[PDB]
Amino acid sequence: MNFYSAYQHGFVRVAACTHHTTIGDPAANAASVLDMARACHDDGAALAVFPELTLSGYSIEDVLLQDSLLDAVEDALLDLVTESADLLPVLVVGAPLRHRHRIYNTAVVIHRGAVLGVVPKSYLPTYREFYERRQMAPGDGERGTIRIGGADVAFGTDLLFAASDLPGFVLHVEIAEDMFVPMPPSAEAALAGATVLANLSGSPITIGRAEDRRLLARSASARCLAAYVYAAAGEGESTTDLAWDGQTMIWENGALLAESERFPKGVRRSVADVDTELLRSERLRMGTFDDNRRHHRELTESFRRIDFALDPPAGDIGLLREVERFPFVPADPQRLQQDCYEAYNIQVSGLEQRLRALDYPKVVIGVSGGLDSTHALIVATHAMDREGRPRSDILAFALPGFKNNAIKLARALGVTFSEIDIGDTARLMLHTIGHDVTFENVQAGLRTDYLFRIANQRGGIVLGTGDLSELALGWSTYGVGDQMSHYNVNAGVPKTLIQHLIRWVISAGEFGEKVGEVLQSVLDTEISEAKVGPFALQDFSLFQVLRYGFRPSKIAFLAWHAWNDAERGNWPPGFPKSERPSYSLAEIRHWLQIFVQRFYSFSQFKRSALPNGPKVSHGGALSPRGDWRAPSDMSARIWLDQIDREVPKG
Amino acid sequence: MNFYSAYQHGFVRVAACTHHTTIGDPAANAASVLDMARACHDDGAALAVFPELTLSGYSIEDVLLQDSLLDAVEDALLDLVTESADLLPVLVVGAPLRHRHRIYNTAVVIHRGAVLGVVPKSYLPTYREFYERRQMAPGDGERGTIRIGGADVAFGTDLLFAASDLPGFVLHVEIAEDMFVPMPPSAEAALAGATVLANLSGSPITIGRAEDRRLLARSASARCLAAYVYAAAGEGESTTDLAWDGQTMIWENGALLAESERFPKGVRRSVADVDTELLRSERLRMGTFDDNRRHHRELTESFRRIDFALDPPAGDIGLLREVERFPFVPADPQRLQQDCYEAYNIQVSGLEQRLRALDYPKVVIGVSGGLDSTHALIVATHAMDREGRPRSDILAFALPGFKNNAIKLARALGVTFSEIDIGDTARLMLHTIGHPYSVGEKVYDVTFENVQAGLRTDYLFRIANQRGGIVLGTGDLSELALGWSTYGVGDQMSHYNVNAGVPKTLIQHLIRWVISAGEFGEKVGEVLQSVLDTEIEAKVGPFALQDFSLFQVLRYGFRPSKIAFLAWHAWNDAERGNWPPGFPKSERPSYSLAEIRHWLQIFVQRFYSFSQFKRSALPNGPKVSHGGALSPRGDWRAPSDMSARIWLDQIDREVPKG
Amino acid sequence: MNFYSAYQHGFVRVAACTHHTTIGDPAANAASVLDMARACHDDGAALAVFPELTLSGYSIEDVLLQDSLLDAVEDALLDLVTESADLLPVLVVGAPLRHRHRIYNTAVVIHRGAVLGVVPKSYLPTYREFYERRQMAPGDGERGTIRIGGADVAFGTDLLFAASDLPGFVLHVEIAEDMFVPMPPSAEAALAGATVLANLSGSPITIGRAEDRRLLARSASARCLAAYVYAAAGEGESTTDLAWDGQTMIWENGALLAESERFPKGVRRSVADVDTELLRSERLRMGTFDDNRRHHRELTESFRRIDFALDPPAGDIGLLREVERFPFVPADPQRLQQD
Ligand SMILES: Nc1ncnc2c1ncn2[C@@H]1O[C@H](COP(=O)(O)OP(=O)(O)OC[C@H]2O[C@@H]([n+]3cccc(C(=O)O)c3)[C@H](O)[C@@H]2O)[C@@H](O)[C@H]1O
Ligand SMILES: Nc1ncnc2c1ncn2[C@@H]1O[C@H](COP(=O)(O)OP(=O)(O)OC[C@H]2O[C@@H]([n+]3cccc(C(=O)O)c3)[C@H](O)[C@@H]2O)[C@@H](O)[C@H]1O
Ligand SMILES: Nc1ncnc2c1ncn2[C@@H]1O[C@H](COP(=O)(O)O)[C@@H](O)[C@H]1O
Ligand SMILES: Nc1ncnc2c1ncn2[C@@H]1O[C@H](COP(=O)(O)O)[C@@H](O)[C@H]1O
């Protein structure tokens, strides 16, 4: 396998194009269309979508009904079809075409010298600035074939274009208004199998209309778990009554992959790599999507499937796609602030309920001066405040065995602080056992043991502080040890997020300037990754595994694109340059071997008996009662073997 | 509410009746039917099912086609209907009735002076000793109405008789052969709602046929999550070519509630209380049952529902049902022997897999001399033997704080044994914590108890790390139920729990079974027997009572007053019902309502509110009982932060003080 | 004619196999499947039924949704298909397979180098210890085809596999829970023609469950006048929350032909000679069975019949069947006392 090929990792390269319109001149439009398709071809694109009525112009009104115009459109269309014999992508081009009694507003799907199909617009707006039913017939409910340059090709609203060599790529096409009605053709098509939904638009621009386009193309792509590929008309359409902004865009399950300049000078393309495996993984897990199909079975079973062989380029063509280094940490500051606000209020409100339900017990917690326990102590405090409970009901413990930040934060917040040296107890235990992991574990164990007994003694509960990345990797001490508690507030927060939560608490500043300074000190001081690898890379793989179940080679491909060059892509706030590492393939490959071994084989038993705590990230959590049911007794051989066979050594 | 009324606890009393046949003489058969129905009424029955072609006799062949016979049947049927005005139960009576062109083999459903409906047999056997298509027409596909004594009443294979005051009682009726075809009318009727399936049979007896009847009525009742009420013809049928055994029976979800004497002299009845709530609870939970209905929706939606008001007796009429004292421990020795063999092989095979998967680590376990840990050590040994591992890889520990059976069993099995006294460590820990006892105070609270339980687990765990072993849990299912364990750092935690799915009441019989089988040898046998004798904490109540409630809650979700009723019927008299093997008379307690009520308050509080958090973070171990287990990854998903108020209030309002 | 050949007297030799499960490792499971299939071949068996989700392991939960796992299953399944080119028996193997939007819990029917069909479980328990709807889609009402290693093969709950040279052998396949609902797929298939009903089961063992299996597989075989061939998962399934007893069994019109050791150490097979003429003879005489089909004609006419040529061994291969000397006098004393 070619590891650097996007097509070999399930990507499909898609283009929404806005061409130069020459109204009433099909050969001119076709020439503009041919030039942009040759570009999409050079880019290795599999699909190029053009605007509504591309070949005539959308704005020409009663001129659509002129024989010479209709005739010119057919001739021009046929020329394009001929030219497509040497073009890689499927081209989806608008044309007014005659069929039976009328003309239809159609998209012609063209590929490698043939027309695969012809799709008529279903819903023809005849209100406000739109007059479409005057010239054109509704296509909803039309099936059968249409004759195009001596051949009968499939015609109708029930068509699916499936790549026989790219099973993840199933195209449905609809037109402009089709997307705006309470039950759009594209939503039935997704249920029936379509993964990529194209829209050819005219869409005269009005104040606020671009927002409406986005709202509907975006929600479509989220509701239908699909890529949505959208092209509107631009320069050249008539301005007798309307203006045109040429907007093009590509959405994937709710996220914007690419858009182009509004009101441009000259032609514009959006080009993106769509991840068919992402779409496939979401559909795999959301059972209710398939239930919805089954409830509408007669609607969804009636589609006709037109097969074609794409034969994509096999080499390196790069990756036209923003892959963030931190799935859990948005690079966009306004987004990351939102995430932090939500994470924090999840941890707090979850603890508050547990405390209300237990009639407000004291809160016992071991504070070491580290990031996790520090953050947990802040969570605990806010929870107690919110519930009108004295901060002295928090019992914080230093438990040194064989920092000041700890006692300072505690003092600054005004919780009850105390120290208990576990060394002598550990010595006694080591001796009694006749005594590495055991040495380490005897101390970790006695910490938990003490807290638990103090909790019994003082009418408290022990607060866990292990974080999501530690659960993922089994980096914790099971049972009698830090893995155990009465309630875990960090269980759902990945390590890479924790530092930004603390930053957010500081920046918000409701704990006061002292607390602020201590927390800032914790940060400066604190920033294991020796033996389990850098947490940036493990949190990366964790997301891919937990959200999508992607195979290891696909994970390596994504990580390498995100991390391999520190200069490319954006970093979140809070990364000075001395701390913007870049990773080689060899490194990514190494830590990924370690990740699959620890995640799939070693660590599950530790997750299996997990204390309570709230789920936090949309990426998922690792509760055996929630997002992650798995065997405690399984080997990781197949994952290790996949890496061995598919990921180059470096 | 009347706590002693079976009807108020969701029971329906049902009768399968075999009457005296007088072939060719409807008024005589009717008179036998009326006499048994008056009995079934006196018993407070809600339903009385009779045999196929009751009113004419099943065996009369072409005489069925004689007008005087057909006429006599109608007159006799109409007399019954009139008499039923003063009878409590719905009567289901067989009759050849004329409809359109032919006679149908039918069941007439009669209630309080009206005919509620008429059901024709669907499949008429015309092979071997059966000739039914010669005289009678197939009823499959017939709908509409039939005229009976001046009234149009529902006729067809699509009928459901629903009690308007007893929602759990929905009756469907089929006939004889109907139950034997690959897709029987009653299976569709169950999907559509029927909870009680009646079968009128003729069923000439042949060698082996009684077994076939049972196999099909039983599997029916299990697949359809229903009661199945079956009545065959007996004395009086013609013996020109056949004989008749009069068999009657009542099945409920796979279990036999009642059967009557085969080949009797005189009439016979089976009468049982059917638990509609048990049926309701199983349908509530088995989602795929409802999925099956949805898949056959056009079949299942077309049923016609005929409503009637039963108005059952409200007082104490007893409880015609065998309620076992020990849901987890069958009183039948052959049954209990089976259950033990299975429980034991479940425990062992589960541990073996964990051991194989961990490449055969040592097994660490704390042995106290008690029932649980003893049994666990036995389990562990057998697992190691089966995997061909040396018994010395089992590391057993005595861990005295502040027995010999323990060291003896260890020595007898040949596992590695050792002692570690946790006293000093506990002393140090109590002092470090500032607990009054480290200063001499005789304060033996939860912290004092817990410091010791904790250190036990803590030691085992560190030994496991040190010696490349895993810690075996030994807490049992009843302890998980009640939260009777020490959470987290304490006996609740381990690497693998073999007893997690076995209730306390079962454990002692598992040990007995291991002794009785005797493959560990006579020494081990003697030590185990000593553990039993020695070992046979009621702040949580008698485990017999809590295991009882646990089964009701975990399997059916029954309300507390229903549980009290059941437990009182099972436990209140030590002379009635059977005890399992191994209960000398000095140990056959009987409980009062007041007692049952007391321990039940404690059960609901502990089960639904206090203990879930301890179940929530549970080690791995195999499910054992069909009653269910308590793994939050398996049979029991529940909140760790809920109150038990409604349960406690239900007891307060519904269960008498004594 | 060869008087000593069981195949010439209307017998079909059938095997229910419980293999060594390696959870999450399809090439290992396929290797255990291939070894047992070679044995069934050497025995002259015409059919070998394996347990539910054979190729992945039944007990792996969310691991089923992992691309590497789904991928490994496909590669392993295609290796088996290739190996089957030299194997006599039809192989019925379990596999989680992707189709349309989801994965289905399926049985793949394999024969002489081809996949004859792919059958999805219809009813997916999601109660008590079972969580199937979480990972897998219900197969009831699915028809059409599925693409398996470059070919379109029949997919759905409506399939019959008929031996073109052994008219009495018509196979229907269902899965686990399918057999436990009031109106099971297998009862409509019998009405439609199936004489041999296979069941691939996971079936974690609980106290009393073995009795439930028997009651339902036995009553199914008696009600449907059929052979019922049943295989449950054993050693190697996860014991995170459940245990497994590896039970296999073969029923014929209400009678047990063969069963294997519960909780065995190592792999186990039941192997029996099913008498297709016996089944044929009972259906010939019990007219109400055909009446029942006619009453459900639209249900029963819709099945698709996939034809294959078995070409069984023609020589003496003995007779794996208890033939009592006295049809009228049972050799079992408890039974004879009853009679
Ligand atoms: N599948 C399975 N099912 C049941 N038991 C299983 C098991 N696999 C191992 N076991 C048993 O469980 C035990 C091993 O697990 P465990 O007791 O946790 O010990 P283990 O994971 O081997 O070691 C804990 C490690 O976590 C690291 N740690 C922990 C806590 C904090 C920090 C820090 O950053 O400061 C680091 C530390 O480096 C240490 O190396 C052994 O008894 C083993 O036999
Ligand atoms: N809902 C909830 N979520 C999270 N945490 C919760 C909680 N409710 C209490 N807690 C906390 O849990 C702790 C109380 O539970 P836990 O630590 O287990 O202790 P707890 O159940 O209060 O006491 C143990 C009891 O079990 C009996 N016991 C123990 C061990 C063995 C045996 C035997 O002989 O078989 C009997 C013993 O006599 C004692 O009465 C407290 O620290 C409390 O604040
Ligand atoms: N020296 C220490 N004193 C008190 N608590 C500690 C100390 N070291 C670690 N902990 C606590 O032990 C848990 C796990 O930390 P660690 O083992 O350092 O990753 C957290 O709750 C820490 O606060
Ligand atoms: N004296 C003891 N020696 C060894 N193990 C014990 C001892 N006491 C308790 N245990 C362990 O703790 C479990 C719970 O019993 P207990 O803690 O005594 O309530 C037992 O089943 C043993 O596994």
What's the per-residue H, E or C state across A417-440?
EEECCCHHHHHHHHHHCCCCHHHH
Q: Alpha-carbon distance B563 to B550, whole Å?
A: 10
In this structure, which amino acid lies at residue B432? Answer: T
B445 and B576 fall within a common domain:
no
Written as six digits, the tokens of A122 are 């279903």
Contact status, residue B136 vs residue B105, Cβ threshold 8 Å: yes
Name the token pair of A79: 């020329």
Amino acid at A59: S
Strands (E), B361-459: 362-366, 394-398, 416-419
Chain A contact present for C102, CB below 8 A: yes
| A218/A611 Cα distance (integer angstroms) | 38
The helix/strand/coil state of A206 is: coil
Nearest to A503 by CA among A519, A490, A491: A519
Helix and strand numbers (H, E) in chain A are: 21, 22
Strands A248-252 and A255-259: antiparallel
Query: In terms of domains, do A161 and A221 share one?
Result: yes
Amino acid at B217: A
B358 touches chain C (CB under 8 A): no
Other residues' Cβ atoms within 10 Å of the Cβ of residue B415? 22
Query: Which regions of C100-246 does DSSP assign to beta strands (E)?
Result: 102-111, 114-120, 126-127, 130-131, 136-137, 145-148, 151-154, 159-163, 170-175, 196-200, 227-231
Residue with tokens 């892509």: A569
What token pair was written down for B447?
Answer: 């912290």
Please state, in angstroms and rounded to a whole number, the distance separating the CA atoms of residues B157 and A25.
72
Rg (CA), chain A: 30
Whole-angstrom Cα distance, residue A199 to residue A158? 15
Using the beta-carbon criterion (under 8 Å), do B289 and C181 form an inter-chain contact? yes
Smallest CA-to-CA distance from B153 within B88, B196, B108 is with B108
Rounded to whole angstroms, the Cα distance separating C224 from B583 reads 45
With beta carbons less than 8 A apart as the criterion, state whether A146 and A155 touch.
yes
Contacts of A500 (CB under 8 A, 6+ apart): A329, A336, A340, A572, A573, A574
Distance (Å, whole) CA B587 – CA B590: 9
Given a contact cutoff of 8 angstroms between Cβ atoms, the answer to whether B279 and B227 are in contact is yes
A498: CATH? 3.40.50.620
Residue C194: left if φ>0, alpha if ψ -120 to 50, beta else—which one?
beta
For residues B567 and B464, give the distance between their C-alpha atoms in angstroms, rounded to a whole number: 43
Cβ of A456 less than 6 Å from ligand 2? yes
The DSSP bridge pattern shows strands B114-120 and B159-163 to be unpaired
Report d(CA B231, CA B250) in Å as an integer.
Answer: 9
For residue A142, give the amino acid letter: E
Q: Does A181 touch chain B (CB under 8 A)?
A: no
> Which secondary-structure segment (H or E) carries B297?
helix B297-301
User: What 8-state DSSP symbol labels residue C332?
Assistant: S
DSSP codes joined into one string, C28-78: HHHHHHHHHHHHHHHTT-SEEE--TTTTT-STTGGGGG-HHHHHHHHHHHH
Give φ, ψ of C131 to 5 degrees: -130, 30
HSE of A39, CA atoms in CB hemisphere, 13 A:
17
With contact defined as beta carbons under 8 Å apart, do B189 and B301 qualify?
A: no
> Do B654 and B550 share a structural domain?
yes
Distance of alpha carbon B348 from alpha carbon B387, whole angstroms: 10
Answer positive or negative: Cα dihedral of A123, A124, A125, A126: negative
What residues of chain B lie within 8 A of the CB of A632, using their CB?
Answer: 354, 620
Nearest ligand 4 atom to the CA of B486 is: 17
**Closest by Cβ to C60, choosing from A281, A285, A634:** A634
Neighbors of chain B with 3 or more C-beta pairs under 8 Å: A, C
Q: Which residue carries 């609203």 as its tokens?
A: A157
Q: Are B193 and B160 in contact (CB under 8 A)?
A: yes
3-state helix, strand, coil in chain B (%, to 5): 45, 20, 40
User: Atom 17 (ligand 2): residue with closest C-alpha?
Assistant: B487
Q: Chains that contact A by 3+ CB pairs under 8 Å?
A: B, C
Three-class DSSP category at C255: strand
Other CB atoms within a 10 A radius of the CB of residue B350 amount to: 30
**DSSP 8-state secondary structure symbol assigned to residue C291:** H
Please give the Cα distance from C39 to C268 (Å, whole number).
11
Cross-chain residue pair C262–B287, CB shorter than 8 Å: no
Non-local (6+) Cβ contacts of B263 within 8 A are B205, B234, B245, B246
Token representation of residue C219 = 């009553």
DSSP secondary structure string for all residues of A636-649? -HHHHHHHHHHS--
- CA dist., res. B79 & res. A520, Å (int): 96
Bridge partners (DSSP) of residue C90 are: C47
**Cβ neighbours of B335 (radius 10 Å):** 14
B299 and B247 within one domain: yes
Residue nearest to atom 11 of ligand 4 (CA): B366
In angstroms, the CA A169 to CA B535 distance is 69
In angstroms, rounded to a whole number, what is the distance separating the alpha carbons of residues A52 and A200? 5
d(CA A351, CA A490): 11
At which of A293, A322, A351 does a domain end?
A322
Q: Given the DSSP bridges, would you call strands C159-163 and C170-175 parallel, antiparallel or unpaired?
A: antiparallel
Contact criterion met (CB below 8 Å) for A463 and A485: yes
Asked if B509 has any chain C CB less than 8 Å from its own CB, the reply is no
Domain boundary among A486, A504, A527: A527
Q: Are residues B93 and B159 in the same domain?
A: yes
Per residue, the 3-state secondary structure of A54-108, as one string, reads CCCCCCCHHHHHCHHHHHHHHHHHHHHHHHHHHCCCEEEEEEEEEECCEEEEEEE
The amino acid present at A558, given as its one-letter code, is L
The Cβ-side half-sphere exposure at B145, using a 13 Å CA radius, reads 10
Residue B286: what residue type? M
Residue reference for tokens 């034969």: A311
Q: Which of residues 370-389 of B touch A (CB under 8 A)?
A: none
Nearest CA to B45 among B83, B13, B86?
B13
B459 and A432 within 8 Å at the Cβ level: the answer is yes
Which run of H or of E encompasses A227? Answer: strand A227-231
Looking at the structure, do residues A431 and A538 belong to the same domain, yes or no?
no
Separation of alpha carbons B194 and B303, rounded Å: 10
Beta bridge partners of B227: B196, B252
Give the closest-approach CA distance of C298 to chain A in angstroms. Answer: 18
Residue the block writes with tokens 């937990």: A546
How far apart, in whole angstroms, are the C-alpha atoms of residue A37 and residue A32?
9
Element spanning C269, H or E: strand C268-275
A:C CB pairs within 8 Å: 87
Whose C-alpha lies nearest to ligand 2, atom 29? B485
Rounded CA separation C241/B621 (Å): 5
Count: domains in chain B: 3
Q: How far from chain centre, in Å, is Cα B592? A: 23
d(CA A327, CA A550): 14
B432 contacts A454 by C-beta, under 8 angstroms = no
Altogether, the residues listed in chain B come to a count of: 658
User: Rounded CA gap, A346 and A369, in Å?
Assistant: 23
Q: Domain range spanning residue B592?
A: 537-658
A568 & A603 share domain = yes
Any residues with CB less than 8 A from the CB of A529 and at least 6 apart, and which? Answer: A535
Q: Are residues B487 and B631 in the same domain?
A: no
Name which of C219, C289, C295 is nearest B215 (Cβ-Cβ).
Answer: C219
How far apart (Å, rounded) are the C-alpha atoms in residues B497 and B475? 7
- Residue that terminates a domain, selected from A297, A322, A347: A322
Element (H, E) at C96: strand C90-99
C79 Cβ neighbours under 8 A, 6+ residues apart: C27, C30
Q: How many CA atoms lie within 13 A of A392 on its CB side?
A: 0
Burial class (CB in 10 A: 0-12, 13-18, 19+), B530: middle
DSSP structure string for B330-358:
-SSHHHHHHHHHHHHHHHHHHHHHHHHHT
Nearest to A581 by CA among A535, A648, A545, A542: A535
Could you tell me the two tokens for A70? 């209709």
CB-nearest partner of B124 from C208, C210, C288: C288
Burial of C85 (0-12, 13-18, 19+ CB in 10 A): exposed
- The first and second tokens of residue C85, run together, are 């080119």
Nearest to C218 by CA among B348, A131, B222: B222
CA angle A411, A416, A422 (to 5 degrees): 100
Whether A105 contacts A96, CB under 8 Å = yes
Contact A445/B at CB under 8 A: yes
First-to-last CA distance in chain A? Answer: 14
Neighbours of C313 (CB within 10 A): 16
| Alpha carbons within 13 A on the beta-carbon side of A10 | 18
The DSSP code for B317 is -
Chain B CB within 8 Å of residue C295 CB:
yes
Which residues lie closer than 8 Å to A604 by C-beta, 6 or more apart? Answer: A630, A631, A632, A634
Looking at the fold, whether A504 and A532 belong to one and the same domain comes out as no
- How are strands ordered across the β-sheet holding A159-163? A255-259, A248-252, A227-231, A196-200, A170-175, A159-163, A304-308
Residues 402-421 of A with CB under 8 A from B: 420
| Residues 6 or more apart whose Cβ sits within 8 Å of residue A8 | A1, A2, A314
Nearest CA-CA distance, residue A631 and chain C, Å: 6
Quick one: tokens of A183? Answer: 């039950």
DSSP A547: I
Tokens of C296: 């459900």
Q: How far is the CA of A466 from the centre of ligand 3 (A)?
A: 10
Amino acid at B655: V
CA distances A456 to B447, B537, C145, Å, are: 6, 20, 62
Q: Are the C-beta atoms of B138 and B125 separated by less than 8 Å?
A: no
Short-list B470, B537, B512, CA closest to B375: B512
CATH of the domain at A95: 3.60.110.10
Beta carbons within 10 angstroms of residue C151's beta carbon? 11
Are both B494 and B550 inside the same structural domain? no
Residue of B345, B371, B322, B366 whose CA lies nearest to B527? B371
Q: Is the dihedral of CA B67, B73, B77, B80 positive or negative?
A: positive
Considering only CB atoms, A354 lies closest to which of B454, B495, B641, namely B641
Task: Answer whether B473 touches C (CB < 8 Å).
Answer: no
What is the H or E stretch that residue A307 is in?
strand A304-308
> Is the Cβ–Cβ distance between B13 and B48 less than 8 Å?
no
Residues in CB range of A208: below 8 A, 6 or more apart: none
DSSP at B51: -
User: Rounded to a whole number, what is the distance in Å from the CA of B446 to chain C's nearest CA?
Assistant: 31
Please report which residue ranges of C87-238 form alpha helices under DSSP H. 132-135, 185-192, 209-223
One domain for residues B176 and B190? yes
Q: Is the CB of B367 under 6 A from ligand 4?
A: yes
* Tokens read off for C287: 């007219």
Check if the beta carbon of residue A516 is closer than 8 Å to that of residue B494. no
Whose structure tokens read 């602020």? A516
Residue from the list A284, A630, A637 with its beta carbon closest to the beta carbon of C63: A630
Atom of ligand 3 nearest to the CA of A528: 19
Say how far apart CA B16 and CA A8 lie, in whole Å: 70
Question: Which stretches of C106-243 are DSSP H helices?
Answer: 132-135, 185-192, 209-223
Answer yes or no: do A287 and C66 touch at CB < 8 A. Answer: no
Integer Cα distance of A388 and B357 in angstroms: 50
Interface test with C, best of B133, B174, B177, B183 (most C CBs within 10 A): B183
Question: From the CA of B417, how far away is ligand 1's center (Å)?
Answer: 25
**What stretches of B100-193 adopt beta strand conformation (E)?**
102-111, 114-120, 145-148, 151-154, 159-163, 170-175
Sign of the Cα torsion A294, A296, A300, A301 reads positive
Closest CA to B37 of B49, B53, B23, B27: B49
Residues in chain A: 650
* Pairwise CB contact (< 8 Å): A631 & C22: no
In what order do the strands lie in the sheet containing B114-120? B114-120, B102-111, B90-99, B47-49, B11-18, B268-275
Residue A589 belongs to domain with CATH number: 1.10.10.1140
